[PDB]
């Protein structure tokens, strides 16, 4: 089997991407944030505290003939940005882009933090990291990918995120029409439950490439590119008037600037992030200070190749016995 679904930015900055997911019988379609940095599939639901729902579409298990309470199971998650959610668990039929899993754990939120409530466009998350990070207790649950894997034509999914445009998540096949050149594969460590890999270095604009190992994760649920402070300082030093602002919480730059590209290495290959991809717009409405898309990972304890980096590539998440990542230009 295979599945193919379109993923659409939630706003004009590509802050996140939503993908429609069918849950239950008859189908209830929710728009979920597919997150390769976490391992819970959780949704706004009929159980969510009413004051914490503001425009999201909810899953109602009582209206699904295939829903079953997973008795005694609970979940609670805290993300890198400080947001959180928790609740109980149902199993139900979940379909993505025509690919169906029966008996998927659907984590129903009883509580969500303010950042979730305030985002009316995201109805929940579908985690695509390794199932060792799943938070369901007392019986850990599998991701949608881990449950689908054995049925897929190939044990892979691909992320093809768009810049200010829709993209695609595919399950079970490589679309050889979706990228240019060849896919360069690189080793993955699953020791922390992430798609963790080592970039071979970077360049700023037309500058020389610096060979240096940068360990980090491929995380579709993170908007920005988080790299070591040395690398980030080297990037923003090429932008006149850029500075790190403690008050704003990262590097800002004049909205009048033209940003340089940023290149990252994948083995001997190179992925070029155009400068435009690194502009996240005014810090507040009408400001001439703009927020940068490359930020320091110092204090986060890991480098994160989030959407700013991933949307410059066709990315293969190879879930074979020994997982690997693949990157292609596009
Ligand atoms: Na922000």
Swiss-Prot record:
One of its GO terms (molecular function) is aspartic-type endopeptidase activity. It comes from the Eukaryota. It is an enzyme of class 3 (hydrolase). Disulfide bonds join 255-290. Its EC number is 3.4.23.22. The active site is at residues 35, 199. Keywords: Aspartyl protease, Disulfide bond, Hydrolase, Protease, Signal, Zymogen. Residues 17-328 form the Peptidase A1 domain. GO terms for biological process: proteolysis. It catalyses: Hydrolysis of proteins with specificity similar to that of pepsin A, prefers hydrophobic residues at P1 and P1', but does not cleave 14-Ala-|-Leu-15 in the B chain of insulin or Z-Glu-Tyr. Clots milk. Belongs to the peptidase A1 family. This is Endothiapepsin. It comes from Cryphonectria parasitica (Chestnut blight fungus).
């Amino acid at each position: 089997s295979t599945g193919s679904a379109t993923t659409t930015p939630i706003d004009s900055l590509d802050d996140a991407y939503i993908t429609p997911v069918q849950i239950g019988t008859p189908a209830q379609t929710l728009n979920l944030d597919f997150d390769t940095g976490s391992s819970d599939l959780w949704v706004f639901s009929s159980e969510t505290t009413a004051s914490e729902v503001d425009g999201q579409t909810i899953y109602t298990p009582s209206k699904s003939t295939t829903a079953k309470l997973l008795s005694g199971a609970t979940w609670s998650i805290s993300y890198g940005d400080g947001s959180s959610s928790s609740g109980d668990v149902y199993t139900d039929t979940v379909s993505v882009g025509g690919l169906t899993v029966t008996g998927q754990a659907v984590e129903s939120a009883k509580k969500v933090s303010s950042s979730f409530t305030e985002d009316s466009t995201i109805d929940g998350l579908l985690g695509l990291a390794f199932s060792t990070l799943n938070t369901v207790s007392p019986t850990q649950q599998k991701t949608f990918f881990d449950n689908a894997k054995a049925s897929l034509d190939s044990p892979v999914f691909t992320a093809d995120l768009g810049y200010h445009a829709p993209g695609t998540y595919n399950f079970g096949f490589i679309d050889t029409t979706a990228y240019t050149g060849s896919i360069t594969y690189t080793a993955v460590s699953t020791k922390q439950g992430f798609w963790e890999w080592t970039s071979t270095g970077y360049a700023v604009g037309s500058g020389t490439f610096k060979s240096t190992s940068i360990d980090g994760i491929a995380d579709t649920g993170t908007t920005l590119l988080y790299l070591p402070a040395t690398v980030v300082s080297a990037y923003w030093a090429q932008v006149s008037g850029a500075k790190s602002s403690s008050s704003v919480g990262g590097y800002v730059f004049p909205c009048s600037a033209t940003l340089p590209s940023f290149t990252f290495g994948v083995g001997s290959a190179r992925i070029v992030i155009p400068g435009d991809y690194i502009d996240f717009g005014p810090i507040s409405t009408g400001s001439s200070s703009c927020f940068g898309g490359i930020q320091s990972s110092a204090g986060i304890g890991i480098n994160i190749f989030g959407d700013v980096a991933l949307k410059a590539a066709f990315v293969v998440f190879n879930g074979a016995t020994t997982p690997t990542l693949g990157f292609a230009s596009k």
